[PDB]
Amino acid sequence: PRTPVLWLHGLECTGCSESFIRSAHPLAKDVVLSMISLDYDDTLMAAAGHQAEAILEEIMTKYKGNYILAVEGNPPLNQDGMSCIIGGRPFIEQLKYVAKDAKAIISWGSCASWGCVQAAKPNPTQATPVHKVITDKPIIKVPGCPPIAEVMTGVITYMLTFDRIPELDRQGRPKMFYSQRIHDKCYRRPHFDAGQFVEEWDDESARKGFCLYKMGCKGPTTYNACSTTRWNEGTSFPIQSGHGCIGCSEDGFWDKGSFYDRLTGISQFG
Amino acid sequence: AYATQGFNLDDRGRRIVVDPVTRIEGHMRCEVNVDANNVIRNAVSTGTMWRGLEVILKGRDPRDAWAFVERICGVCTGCHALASVRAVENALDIRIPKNAHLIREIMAKTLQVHDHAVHFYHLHALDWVDVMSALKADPKRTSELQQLVSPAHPLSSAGYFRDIQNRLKRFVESGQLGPFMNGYWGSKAYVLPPEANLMAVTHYLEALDLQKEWVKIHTIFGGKNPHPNYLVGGVPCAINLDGAASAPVNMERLSFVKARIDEIIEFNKNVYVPDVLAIGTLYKQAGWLYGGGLAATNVLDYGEYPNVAYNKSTDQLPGGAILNGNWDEVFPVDPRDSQQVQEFVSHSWYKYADESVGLHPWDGVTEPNYVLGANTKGTRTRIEQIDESAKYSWIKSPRWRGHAMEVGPLSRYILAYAHARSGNKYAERPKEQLEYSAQMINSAIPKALGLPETQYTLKQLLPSTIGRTLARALESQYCGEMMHSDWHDLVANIRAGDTATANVDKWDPATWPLQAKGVGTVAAPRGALGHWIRIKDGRIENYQCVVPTTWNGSPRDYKGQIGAFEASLMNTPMVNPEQPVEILRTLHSFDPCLACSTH
């Protein structure tokens, strides 16, 4: 038998679901057909309305304390929770209900992990990360906007193989994917180390792949696997394609000033 | 009960609720009323989420806006970034270099293909395809069907279909049906034979594996997919052919992009378009021509993909507005005209100073107001039946000169057809596609499957759920073809000696006018997208988005006129009122993006 996954959606853009299906190793097809049982997921599921909601009860009963709750997006607390409505009720009520009997909870992406764009100032819906609402369950944060596809499926693969949560850092992120800053192994580091920087877009330095620090790159303060694992089966990552990291896996990255404002105190990242 | 736009709305019948609407992006609730014969006589579209990006953007730097609004949606990923940079560039009088234009067009067309194909197979197909019926299918007859539907597709042997069928069989036999759990399998609303179902489910699996390849085009130019990076003034992916290895774009990277484009063209031509033509033919033969809604009268798009940059007369999907089903008169659409695009909130969870009027988006206001009408059944936090006489959605109500319009690929294809018949040469390819498709649906496919020939015109065939689905597939094909040409133009320009990718003359806010306004429009996968910005002292004064699903999914306006979703559901019989198969089939034909609609 395959471990049930109930994949809930709060306030979100659905980019985490999309990233998930880009996975090449393993293929999402193989994850869905041979690894997990994806029993609830609004994006892909055949059933709607009453038939969809009835699945939750059935899986929770049959697999009590032996299903994974995956959460994409987050619950709003303003508007009496009705800035995100499921089955005529606030999303937060569904989240809490499904969370109570989960074996483990995966907070997909920066939405579930931290709050992300809807939680940026002034946060009109009081969108709140999952770990601030569910306080009595094991949660793994898999941040990024969205996370890398193979990181998402990598977490699932570990959990299914070992029936354990992988080792987490103090922020609740898996060390196997989030131990390095972008800047640690970024291929532009030799330019950073030599003070070789892009100063204006498409200057001669940019055409030579010089470091993007002075164009606002937040790689020095951002933990993710982008510089090594890279994106879409190792095809590229933001810096390789010419734009600085915007810090999309870090808590509160929308409210650290302009993406194009450089980090201060360059000497601390040498 | 009341009449509007030729629809006789009546809420006296049996009320049916569908919440959540699944196999869409984001959150929607749908309610309908059906008459004594299970025919829908009222429909209510409720957007059930809001995040408030327009509010969040206030006071921020226009150069950062694209990244915020990109996160409106990870499905139509990048189209908001494109609208944003266009809006800021329009505000600040910035002309981007040719290579940046071409790379943006390639990225846009890559999104079109990916979004369209994934939608059809992974969200829409299960409304037409019975997966349990596919288990009954005979592999050899499926092979023979595949050869008739698309001769050129190399994956066609009986053994191949047998292997696929076997994996599906043990999956279902396991007792853990996953995404197929509690489905509406066996409903009389399903009409395909087993072998067509097996063919389609096989292509669902093929498309799921292939779709990840196509987006590598985004990854090269924009670093990642979902959410590739954009830039005010151009693109960040600087060019060097040669130290070429160190530049974001070199010839090797461009050759990789071309290889991906070529694969896309094969998929659209051999898998996607043929499947939609075949499925459409079979449901046409069953008489399922419901779901036309507003497509039969009022359609709109801003127009997109000019052959010559900044020259709108050369749009390869030429736009405008059609009213009252008169395809001989296309009205020009101006997104700058305060009297054209306007949004009402009379029946939405927002407030204006005066809700009897619609606001043009440069004057738009986004203040939440979650309140339910007196005739609601249930409570503020436990709705049993929504009261559509009052405020019932997080989606605003966009109208054009007061008219309710349908937007999307179907709208663009009707507009293209109308333009082509006015003499517009830029629309010749979509006209060719439509005439080809009608001939296949009416004559060629029926002849090959031993069914009677029909004589539907495009005027009769296009305004329908089948037509809406067809237009999406044809648009995917056309977009693949267009970016193939864009790629050649890009490489030619670079080899001619123009390597420029960014205009930075007005990158620094010290160079900007102290006040400015701009608009950026995009033919997004689901229809007409616009971002309207006001800039003051280097900061965002106002930022308003009107998104395709905002148009299509909108609630009623001040005059009580219905939007595209609500109109499309009207007058549709349901086989079983508590199985929303027909509701899903038609709603899904719009490819609803609810996070987009509400932002």
Ligand code: NFU
């Ligand atoms: N296409 C599209 Fe989006 Ni997720 C919508 N509606 C965009 O603008």
Ligand code: SF4
């Ligand atoms: S984390 Fe980013 S990509 Fe994922 S749902 Fe949230 S906004 Fe979208």
Ligand code: SF4
């Ligand atoms: S600042 Fe950014 S571009 Fe430069 S070396 Fe560090 S991560 Fe790479």
Ligand code: F3S
């Ligand atoms: S913007 Fe995000 S995708 Fe990686 S390079 Fe930076 S953490």
Ligand SMILES: [Cl-]
């Ligand atoms: Cl965040």
Ligand SMILES: [Mg+2]
């Ligand atoms: Mg808006």
Ligand code: NA
């Ligand atoms: Na730099």
Ligand code: NA
């Ligand atoms: Na552009």
Ligand code: NA
């Ligand atoms: Na006609």
